[PDB]
Amino acid sequence: MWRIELKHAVNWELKMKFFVLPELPTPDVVESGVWRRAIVLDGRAVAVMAYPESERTIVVEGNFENREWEAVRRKLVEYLGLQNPEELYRFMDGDEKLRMLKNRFYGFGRAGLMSMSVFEGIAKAIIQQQISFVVAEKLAAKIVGRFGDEVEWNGLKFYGFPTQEAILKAGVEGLRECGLSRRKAELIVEIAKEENLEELKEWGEEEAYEYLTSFKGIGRWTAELVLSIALGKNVFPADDLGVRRAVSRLYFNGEIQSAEKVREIARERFGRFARDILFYLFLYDRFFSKELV
Ligand SMILES: [Hg+2]
Ligand code: NA
Ligand code: NA
After folding, report:
1. Residue 240 catalytic?
2. Where is the signal peptide, in residue numbers (predicted)?
3. Which of 38, 88, 115, 170 could in theory staple to 151 by disulfide, Cβ–Cβ 3.0 to 4.6 A?
4. In the CATH scheme, what is the homologous superfamily, with its name and number, of domain 1-113?
């Protein structure tokens, strides 16, 4: 048992609702409000699970060492988005439509990340190209099942996203076998060859953008999605069709707007909080719009 003590309440149920296929190891599994996965920690996979004991206290259990707690805690705070949302909430209150979003998903707090490594974030962004998020997540589950780490601890199985090494071994054909198009498989293997990839998190936005887009098959949308959802940078992915739909529904009474207009809105209304608001827009798009002939 370790405990993460928060200054502000978090709605755990809303944090978990963010997961699209909670039962399936994508690699994350959420079962009866308990989240778990295997994470690679100093070259070895460990079991980690987390669940609330109160509005302001998240319990963590796992088979890592006590001296590794500080590192694990930092990773979970950033990934699950547990940081004090007071200032975000104050800011959202100042805009009629943001206030509407804040209240619809109240207690969601700040945005986390959608991966526990840069490699995982890039691979998943590539998988998602030209397909729905639900289809992308099933593909992730196939790859995790065959090529990911597996840890058995207590009576429970913990799944991890494939290491760069595991992907290189899977190769193009192993990824194609799991359902990936040839080019996607090719690009993921390409990325797997890169050294020091976790350092990309600490690069500047513009440098990271030029690195990502320097790969053939990674364009503006994939690079901006990685920057925001994997790297934690305040880069707003306006080409995303779900984002365009949500912003149009909120501010333009459902009249579909261009990416350039959405960018303009984010600049004017979202400011330093655009990355947090982006996660609220994903929820809005999924849960209040995603007929009749
Ligand atoms: Hg403990
Ligand atoms: Na899952
Ligand atoms: Na490119």
Report:
1. yes
2. none
3. 38
4. DNA-3-methyladenine glycosylase AlkA, N-terminal domain (3.30.310.20)
